[PDB]
C-alpha cells in the first residue's frame, strides 16, 4: 500500500434503480432486476477497453453505483481529471442506451473530486484493492448530494476543468460531515 499526490476519484450512482428493484414470484424474487443491473454494469465495463479510457481504473461497484479513478498508473499535468469527466459522459451514453431497450428512464448522478489518496490491499482473507483518504470521501459526497444528469465537482476540481474548456455553474454550499461547509459546482454542457 502506497500513497499518491493527484488521483481523480469518481462515483456514478443510478438512484432511480432502488425504486425499480422489486421481489415478486414473477421476477424470480428480484433476480430479473439484478439481471438488468448486470447488463448496465457490464456495458459500463465494456468502456474501460476503449483506448481513450486506458488510464481509467475501476475500483468497485457499491450497489448500483460505479466507482472509478484516474492517475493510479502514475508515480499536461492534470489531463487525467479531464478524462474522468470524459468517462462519466460515456456512462451516460451507455445508461441512455439501456433505457432505449429496457423501456426505462435511468438517470446517472455523478460526483468527481481529486487529490491525495492511499491505494492498496485490505483484508487478510480475499485481498481486494481499494483507495482511502479524504479525497475519496468528498468524491462520494459529491455523488450522494448530487443532482441527476449532472456532474458535481469541488472548487479546485472546477478551476481545473475550467483550464480545459469546461464551463461550470455554482451549485451552492454543502456540509460535508468532517470538513464542514464547502462550495461545489455543476459541470455545464
Amino acid at each position: 500500500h502506497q500513497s499518491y499526490d493527484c488521483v481523480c476519484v469518481m462515483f456514478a450512482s443510478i438512484p432511480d434503480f432502488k425504486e425499480f428493484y422489486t421481489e415478486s414470484d414473477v421476477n424470480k424474487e428480484g433476480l430479473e432486476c439484478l439481471r438488468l443491473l448486470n447488463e448496465i454494469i457490464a456495458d459500463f465495463d465494456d468502456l474501460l477497453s476503449k483506448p481513450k479510457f486506458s488510464g481509467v481504473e475501476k475500483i468497485k461497484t457499491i450497489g448500483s453505483t460505479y466507482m472509478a479513478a484516474t492517475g493510479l498508473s502514475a508515480i499536461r499535468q492534470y489531463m487525467h481529471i479531464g478524462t474522468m469527466v470524459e468517462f462519466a459522459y460515456a456512462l451516460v451514453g451507455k445508461l441512455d442506451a439501456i433505457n432505449k431497450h429496457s423501456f426505462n428512464d435511468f438517470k446517472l448522478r455523478v460526483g468527481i473530486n481529486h487529490g491525495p489518496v492511499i491505494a492498496g490491499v485490505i483484508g487478510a482473507q480475499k485481498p481486494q484493492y481499494d483507495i482511502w483518504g479524504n479525497t475519496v470521501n468528498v468524491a462520494s459526497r459529491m455523488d450522494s448530494t448530487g443532482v441527476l444528469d449532472k456532474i458535481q465537482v469541488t472548487e479546485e476540481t472546477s478551476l481545473i476543468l475550467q483550464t480545459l474548456g469546461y464551463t461550470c455553474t455554482c451549485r451552492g454550499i454543502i456540509n460535508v460531515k468532517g470538513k464542514g461547509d464547502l462550495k461545489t459546482y455543476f459541470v455545464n454542457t
Binding site: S24, D25, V26, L36, K100, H101, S102, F103, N104
Partner: protein, 334 residues
C-alpha cells in the same frame, strides 16, 4: 422438466387487447366468482356514459342534444361523475338509458375518436336494462368486453393437450413498460398485440400521439430489441371487427392519418375471408404490411414474424388462431 413448458409474453400498447386474450385462455383452457365483476361492468357503464356527455361541449364544433330536456339528466350524470363509492341506484340507469337514446348524445359517440373512450361503450349501453337487474349474471361475452386496465405482471398457467403454457400479461401503457424486461430472458415467444381499429385515435398518455403509430414504434422497439434477437414475435392484429366497421362506415378515412395508404394496392398472396369486402381486405392487409416492413428490414433469420388477423372478443376466432400458434411453437422450439 423445464423444457416441456412454454413461457409466452403478451406485449402491445395500452388497450391493445392483451387482457382479453388471457381471458379467452380461461374461457378456452382453464377451470361467488363473477358477482364481483358485475361492479366492474357497472363502472364501465358509468365511466362510458359520463365520458360521452362530458365530451359533448368540449368538441369542435360542440354537440347539442336533440332533446334539451335531457339537460337535467346530463346535469345528473355530471354531478355524480367523481363520486367515490357509487351506490348505483335505479335512477342512474333510467338517466343513462335516456341520454343514450338522445340522437345528439349518440352523434357525439360517433366522434368518440376525438376524445378518450373505452371500447365497451356502445356494447354495454345497448344493454343497460339487462345490467340494472339486481339478479344480473354477466355473460361470458360480458366478462370479455369488460375493462380493467392492466397494472403489473400477471402469470397465467394453462394446458393444451398435456402441453404446458405460461402466459404473462403486462401494462401496455408507457409508465408500465419498464416491467417488460422482467420477462425478457427465457421467453419462448412474444405475442405482440395491436388494436388495428385504433388507426384514427391518439394515446391516453399524451392525447396527441396516434395509437397505431405508437403501436408501430413499440413493435420496432421489440423487433430490434437487444435482448430479443433470437425471439420470434407472433403478431395479433387485434380488433378486426372494429376495423371492418370503421372502413365500411367511411367516416374517418385511413389515408387521412397514414397517407402512404393512398398508394397501397392489395397484395397477391391475399386470402380474404369468405365474402369480406375488398375494401376491408385492402385495409386489414395494409396494416399488416405496415408491421411487416419493420420485421422484414432486420433479424437475419435468427428470429421470425407471424401475422394473424384477430378478434379477441370472439372465442371463435381465438381458438383458431391460438392453435395456429401451437403449430408454430412446436415446429420452431423443437
Amino acid at each position: 422438466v423445464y423444457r416441456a413448458t412454454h413461457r409466452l409474453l403478451l406485449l402491445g400498447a395500452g388497450e391493445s387487447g392483451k387482457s382479453t386474450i388471457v381471458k379467452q385462455m380461461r374461457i378456452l383452457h382453464v377451470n361467488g366468482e363473477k358477482a364481483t365483476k358485475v361492479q366492474d361492468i357497472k363502472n364501465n357503464l358509468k365511466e362510458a356514459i359520463e365520458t360521452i356527455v362530458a365530451a359533448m361541449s368540449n368538441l369542435v364544433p360542440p354537440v347539442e342534444l336533440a332533446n334539451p330536456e335531457n339537460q337535467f339528466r346530463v346535469d345528473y350524470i355530471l354531478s355524480v361523475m367523481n363520486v367515490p363509492d357509487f351506490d348505483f341506484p335505479p335512477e342512474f340507469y333510467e338517466h343513462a338509458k335516456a341520454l343514450w337514446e338522445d340522437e345528439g348524445v349518440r352523434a357525439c359517440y360517433e366522434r368518440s375518436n376525438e376524445y378518450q373512450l373505452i371500447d365497451c361503450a356502445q356494447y354495454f349501453l345497448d344493454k343497460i336494462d339487462v345490467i340494472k337487474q339486481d339478479d344480473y349474471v354477466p355473460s361470458d361475452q360480458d366478462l370479455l368486453r369488460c375493462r380493467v386496465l392492466t397494472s403489473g405482471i400477471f402469470e397465467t398457467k394453462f394446458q393444451v393437450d398435456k402441453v404446458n403454457f405460461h402466459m404473462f400479461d403486462v401494462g401496455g401503457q408507457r409508465d408500465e413498460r419498464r416491467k417488460w424486461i422482467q420477462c425478457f430472458n427465457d421467453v419462448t415467444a412474444i405475442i405482440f398485440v395491436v388494436a388495428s381499429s385504433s388507426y384514427n385515435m391518439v394515446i391516453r398518455e399524451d392525447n396527441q400521439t396516434n395509437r397505431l403509430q405508437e403501436a408501430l414504434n413499440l413493435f420496432k422497439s421489440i423487433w430490434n430489441n437487444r435482448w430479443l434477437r433470437t425471439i420470434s414475435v407472433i403478431l395479433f392484429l387485434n380488433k378486426q371487427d372494429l376495423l371492418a366497421e370503421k372502413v365500411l362506415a367511411g367516416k374517418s378515412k385511413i389515408e387521412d392519418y397514414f397517407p402512404e395508404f393512398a398508394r397501397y394496392t392489395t397484395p397477391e398472396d391475399a386470402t380474404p375471408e369468405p365474402g369480406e369486402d375488398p375494401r376491408v381486405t385492402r385495409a386489414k392487409y395494409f396494416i399488416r404490411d405496415e408491421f411487416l416492413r419493420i420485421s422484414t428490414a432486420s433479424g437475419d433469420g435468427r428470429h421470425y414474424c407471424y401475422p394473424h388477423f384477430t378478434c379477441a372478443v370472439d372465442t371463435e376466432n381465438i381458438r383458431r388462431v391460438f392453435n395456429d400458434c401451437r403449430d408454430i411453437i412446436q415446429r420452431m422450439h423443437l
